[PDB]
Curated annotation (Swiss-Prot):
Disulfide bonds: none annotated. Interacts with cognate antitoxin DarG (via C-terminus); this heterodimeric complex neutralizes the toxic effect of DarT by preventing ssDNA binding to DarT and consequently inactivating the toxin by direct protein-protein interactions. The lineage of its organism: Bacteria, Thermotogati, Deinococcota, Deinococci, Thermales. One of its GO terms (molecular function) is nucleotidyltransferase activity. NAD(+) binds at residues 14-16, 23, 31, 52. Toxic component of the hybrid type II/IV toxin-antitoxin (TA) system DarTG, which plays a crucial role in controlling bacterial growth and bacteriophage infection. In case of phage infection, DarT toxin ADP-ribosylates DNA, which inhibits both viral DNA and RNA synthesis and leads to abortive infection. ADP-ribosylates ssDNA on the second thymidine of the consensus sequence 5'-TNTC-3'; the protein does not auto-modify. Arg-52 is highly flexible, allowing it to assume multiple positions in the crystal structures. Its toxic effect is neutralized by cognate antitoxin DarG. The active site is at 52 (proton acceptor), 161. The NAD(+)-binding element stabilizes the ADP-ribosylating turn-turn (ARTT) loop which confers substrate specificity; both domains contribute to ssDNA-binding. Its EC number is 2.4.2.-. This is DNA ADP-ribosyl transferase. It comes from Thermus sp. (strain 2.9). InterPro entries: DarT. The keyword Iron does not apply. It catalyses: a thymidine in DNA + NAD(+) = an N-(ADP-alpha-D-ribosyl)-thymidine in DNA + nicotinamide + H(+).
Length: 210
């Protein structure tokens, strides 16, 4: 006899190459793929990339996954694993990859349109939601899983996504997590070039990486 719950607050994580940070700070936002972002560096699995151009979103404001900025509900994501494993076109590995941390509740409180899924949003079987209470429908056991090799559904459910329409404001980022001290020190040197950008905490979290 159990009732489905979810973590409150609900952290959300977006991974990006450090080379993109200057563009984000200058714009004050992360732009969705389809909004012509000032992206320096793709870390994008090309087979996922093409699929996000045509993966339809059934909750308003609708469109395709490339109309949204994607966050996952865990660090040390399967997409990060693809970067670590060299499976992406991008061959620089995980050390230059930042985790940008926010929360689902912060996006709602800011009044920004969002949708979220219970599994990788390119899957035809993905379910989509737009109310925070429906976070209970996700498989938190999979999302939080350190063991996700088998069954095959674990990799899929662990890629549950929090999708923010068109743009994600920089000032909703509470933490930049990094692989190493040397990357953290480079992040602080970039933040200081944009003294009017919010300066979130910068944290070394080698345990969020493979
Ligand atoms: Cl997705």
């Amino acid at each position: 006899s159990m009732k489905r719950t979810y973590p409150e607050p609900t952290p959300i994580y977006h991974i990006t190459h450090i080379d993109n940070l200057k563009g984000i700070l200058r714009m004050g936002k992360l732009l969705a793929h389809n909004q012509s972002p000032p992206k320096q560096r793709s870390i994008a699995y090309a087979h996922i990339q093409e699929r996000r151009n045509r993966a339809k979103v059934p909750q308003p404001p609708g469109g395709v996954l490339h109309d949204y900025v994607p966050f996952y509900f865990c660090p040390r994501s399967p997409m990060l694993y693809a970067i670590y494993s060299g499976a992406t076109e991008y061959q620089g590995g995980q050390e230059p990859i930042l985790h940008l941390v926010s929360s689902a509740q912060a996006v709602h409180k800011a009044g920004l349109p969002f949708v979220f899924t219970d599994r990788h949003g390119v899957l035809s079987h993905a379910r989509f939601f737009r109310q925070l209470e429906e976070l209970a429908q996700l498989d938190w056991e999979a999302i939080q899983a350190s063991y996700w090799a088998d069954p095959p559904e674990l990799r899929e459910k662990k890629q549950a996504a929090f999708l923010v329409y068109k743009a994600f404001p920089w000032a909703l980022i509470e933490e930049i997590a990094v692989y190493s001290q040397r990357v953290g020190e480079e992040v602080l040197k970039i933040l200081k070039q944009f003294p009017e950008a919010r300066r979130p905490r910068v944290c070394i979290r080698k345990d969020w990486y493979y």
